[PDB]
Each structure stands twice: as structure tokens, then as C-alpha cells.
């Protein structure tokens with residue numbers, strides 16, 4: 001109750017008041033205290049003019065933002081702070097890359113709202129685990145594929161359909177249908193398997209050049225931008241990349257532990273006895289992260305610095321790899337850990 005009251009009655013604080021570099025690619029949104037993030041969401045929506053443009057009801061918007069925050073659990077990585085940082089990067093793309101030259105206003109709004117909702121109710125486990133553990137989610141969606149992503153979308157729609165939380169309530173039937181369809185496309189694009197399936201079409205688009213009159217190019221660009229937001233922790237400094245690795249592997253190893261208890265053999269990356277982090281992170285950066293930001297650079301010249309910072313963080317991992325081998329004796333002057 002109290003949180004809602006202040007969010008609604010204190011006024012939407014100016015975006016620059018959050019941080020002086022808030023609109024910069026150098027800013028790390030994970031440094032913002034979690035208690036300040038809901039107001040930051042409002043401040044960003046205001047600064048992008050979405051509240052005014054779509055005449056979003058402020059009481060409704062405040063309830064929506066809090067309910068979305070409440071719909072994330074607390075696994076090490078896939079929590080509200082992930083969603084906030086992803087949404088923040090969407091804002092950064094709006095501020096720095098002139099998205100208004102490529103996408104419709106409603107598409108940009110949909111991207112931002114999708115970022116907020118894209119990992120709703122994540123349980124710290126991937127799609128394979130849902131099928132293997134015969135979860136309720138796999139019962140619902142395994143035959144369609146993208147189990148978790150369909151669940152994230154359905155949670156987002158359930159929030160909208162909660163009384164007092166439909167921020168699109170006044171939209172026309174056409175614009176409402178448009179928004180929900182965009183959210184579906186964008187949230188489902190956060191599945192790695194989807195990204196892999198469209199990756200050649202993304203390269204084709206970047207080769208022939210973006211045609212803003214081509215409806216397929218809008219769709220493809222939206223998928224690329226969404227994945228860029230989802231992986232945006234890799235575009236910051238080394239320390240952020242190091243911390244997120246810690247969170248990512250804590251989550252993965254928990255799943256791997258669960259899988260061993262069910263009698264299944266986990267992936268190397270989820271097996272704490274077998275996983276070599278530097279090599280795995282290098283691989284993720286080279287095969288997944290870097291190509292996404294290279295395509296981004298190919299489409300937006302001003303995105304160059306993002307690819308550059310990811311490539312540098314990739315080299316930082318190679319530089320620090322030797323630190324994973326124990327030289328000399330450990331701090332305690334003992335070799336007891338061998339027994």
C-alpha cells in the first residue's frame with residue numbers, strides 16, 4: 001500500500017535525478033538500489049513520452065509496475081534486477097540510437113514493456129529442465145516449444161487482466177491487438193533457439209540494409225533489439241561481466257545439482273564439478289553475445305562502442321584465465337584440499 005501511495009502522489013521524478021549518466025551506455029543500472037527501481041521505470045516511460053502519448057492512467061501504471069516487480073522470484077540471475085537492467089538498456093537504445101528512425105512509436109513502447117515482463121516468474125531453470133522434470137509449464141507449453149517464454153508472456157497478460165492493472169485499457173481494439181501481438185513476438189524472441197533460427201535472416205537484413213517500409217525488417221529488428229537488451233550486462237565494464245558470471249553460474253549449478261538428484265546428467269556448464277568458467281564465458285561471448293552486437297553495429301553506427309566493450313570484456317577473460325590455476329601453495333600453506 002505505502003509503496004503505491006508514494007509512487008502515485010510524490011510525482012514522477014526527473015530521469016537525470018536518478019543518475020547524471022543515467023542516459024549513457026557507461027551507466028550500470030544494477031548500481032541503483034532496488035527500492036528506487038519502480039520510480040525509475042516511471043521516470044523512463046515519462047522521458048520517452050509514453051505516458052502522455054498513450055494517455056496512460058497514472059494509478060493504473062503504478063499498480064502495473066509494482067505487480068510486474070512482484071511477479072519475479074529471487075533466483076541469483078533471473079530476478080527483478082535483471083528485468084530492470086534489461087528495460088534500462090531499452091531506454092538507452094531509445095536515447096542513443098534514434099530508434100524513431102527505424103520503428104513505429106508503438107513498437108518501441110511494446111519493446112520497453114516486453115523488457116519489463118520478459119522473464120516473469122522465472123524459477124532459475126531453463127526450458128530443457130521443465131520438460132525433464134515434467135513441470136506444469138511443460139505440461140502447458142512443451143508441444144509448442146519455448147516453454148518458459150510462453151509462460152513469461154502468459155504471466156504478463158495475466159497482470160494486464162488483473163483489475164486496475166490494464167495500462168492499455170483505453171486503447172482501440174486494433175492498437176490493443178497490436179500491443180499484445182508485439183509483446184508475444186518480442187517475449188518469444190528471448191528464447192536462444194528462436195534467435196538461432198532467425199540469425200541468417202538478421203545477417204541478410206544487415207547486408208541489404210534496413211528498409212523501414214519492410215514489415216519483416218521491423219519484426220527482425222525488434223527481435224535483435226530484445227536480445228541486445230537481454231544480454232546487455234556484457235556491454236558494461238569488466239566488473240559487471242564478472243559479477244553476472246557469478247550469478248549465472250550459481251543459477252546454472254543449482255539446476256545441475258537438481259538434475260543429478262533426478263538421475264540425469266547435466267550439461268557441462270551446469271555441472272559444478274566439470275565447468276571451467278573462463279572457457280565457457282569466452283565461448284558464450286564469441287558465439288552468442290558478440291555476433292548480436294556486431295549485427296547491432298552493422299545496423300546502427302553509434303552502437304560501435306557496445307560491440308567494442310563486449311570484445312574487450314572477452315579479452316579480459318582470456319587475460320585472467322591463469323588465475324584459475326593455483327600457483328605455489330594456497331593461502332593456508334596446506335594441500336589438505338587434495339585429500
Ligand SMILES: CCCCOc1cncc(-c2nnc3c(C)nc4ccc(CN5CCOCC5)cc4n23)c1
Pocket residue numbers: 126190191192195227230231244245248269281284
Ligand atoms: C539470445 C538471448 C538469450 C536470452 O536468454 C537467456 C537465457 N538464459 C541465459 C542467458 C544468458 N544471459 N547471460 C548469460 C551468460 C553470461 N552466459 C551464458 C552462458 C550460456 C548460455 C546458454 N544457455 C544454454 C542452455 O542452458 C542455459 C544457458 C546463456 C548464458 N547467459 C540468456
Ligand SMILES: [Mg+2]
Pocket residue numbers: 118119190191
Ligand atoms: Mg528468458
Ligand SMILES: [Zn+2]
Pocket residue numbers: 082086118119190230
Ligand atoms: Zn532475460
